[PDB]
């Protein structure tokens, strides 16, 4: 269909993928660092969600270089994804409006 809606859907699928690889790689990055808490997968996936929506309570966060790099990727992927949706909703609204007139 319309490009904007395809880019949106694509971004959402990709986000779900970044959340899962992000959870996997965070645990992999953080185990081995004394004091780290981002070390079991169920809570890491939750950590990935709250990082992507940029909510960041946090209750958990990375302390190593690679966990932080993985964190930045999750952030960016979520901020970009949510931004692509807004943008598509604007495209849709601009079109229907030019019609309503």
């Amino acid at each position, epitope marked *: 269909s319309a490009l904007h809606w395809r880019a949106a859907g694509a971004a959402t699928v990709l986000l779900v993928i970044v959340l899962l690889a992000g959870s996997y790689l965070a645990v992999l990055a953080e185990r*081995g660092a004394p*004091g780290a*808490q981002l070390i*079991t*997968y*169920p809570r890491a996936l939750w950590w990935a969600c709250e990082t992507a929506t940029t909510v960041g309570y946090x209750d958990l966060y990375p302390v190593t270089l690679w966990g932080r790099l993985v964190a930045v990727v999750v952030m960016v992927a979520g901020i970009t994804s949510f931004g692509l949706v807004t943008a598509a909703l604007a495209t849709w609204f601009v079109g229907r409006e030019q019609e309503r007139r």
Partner: antibody, heavy 118, light 108 residues
Framework: QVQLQQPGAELVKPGASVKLSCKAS????????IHWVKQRPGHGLEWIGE????????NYNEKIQKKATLTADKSSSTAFMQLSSLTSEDSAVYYC???????????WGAGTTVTVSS | DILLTQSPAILSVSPGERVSFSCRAS??????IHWYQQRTNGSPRLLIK???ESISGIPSRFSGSGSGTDFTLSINSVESEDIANYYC?????????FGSGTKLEIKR
């Protein structure tokens, strides 16, 4: 059926090195970690290290001297622990255990009794 | 790293009585504590996970409770097969660590 199979025993001479194995069966996931735990006669459980077979990375207990090196074999579903340059201090039962990445050792091997003697 | 203190190291109870093993963490670990049973010559056996969650195959008699730094493993009406050593283990922070162990003894 038995999930983690380990040899019953190993005899090692002071200074020599031995490599223990742990053959895993049953459900295997990309998120499994294989841990090694050391128990000396009468005493408690001491964590040695862990490895994630699907990626090959291992971490070690930093509060103790490093006698171990862990490796895994994806094809043969076997994790190995190379103990090297042993002394009587290294004689104990060594268990492998499996963790589904959620923090608890759901299942343990029967343990390999290691004896360091001339 | 997280120190898990199990005290007393030996607990003596009368057949059928209520027993409670204690595990105290050096800092707060939510409910990330797990309990194991290791009988003489046996390998450890998971009894309770995440402080209070039951495991399949474990008698209903076994229960756990606590959150934060203080944890208890309880046995309702202890029996002979419960004679063993009991360990707690935390997974809240790296690296995982074990408590030193409590032995259950029965007075018959």
């Amino acid at each position: 059926q038995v999930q983690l199979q380990q040899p019953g025993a190993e005899l090692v001479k002071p200074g020599a090195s031995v490599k223990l194995s742990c053959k895993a069966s049953g459900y295997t996931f990309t998120s499994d970690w294989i841990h090694w735990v050391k128990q000396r006669p009468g005493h408690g459980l001491e964590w040695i290290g862990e490895i994630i077979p699907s990626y090959g990375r291992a971490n070690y207990n930093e509060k103790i001297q490093k006698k171990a090196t862990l490796t895994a074999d994806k094809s043969s579903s076997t994790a190995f622990m190379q103990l090297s340059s042993l002394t009587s201090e290294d004689s104990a039962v060594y268990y492998c255990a499996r963790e589904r990445g959620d923090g608890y050792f759901a299942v343990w091997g029967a343990g390999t009794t290691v004896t360091v003697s001339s | 790293d997280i120190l898990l203190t199990q005290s007393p190291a030996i607990l003596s109870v009368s057949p059928g009585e209520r027993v409670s093993f204690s595990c105290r963490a050096s800092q707060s670990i939510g409910t990330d504590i797990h309990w194991y049973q290791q009988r003489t010559n046996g390998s450890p056996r998971l009894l309770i996970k995440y402080a209070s969650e039951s495991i399949s195959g474990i008698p209903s008699r076994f229960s756990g409770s606590g959150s934060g730094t203080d944890f208890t493993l309880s046995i309702n009406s202890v029996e002979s097969e419960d004679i063993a050593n009991y360990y707690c283990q935390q997974s809240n922070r790296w690296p995982f660590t074990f408590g030193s162990g409590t032995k259950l003894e029965i007075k018959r």
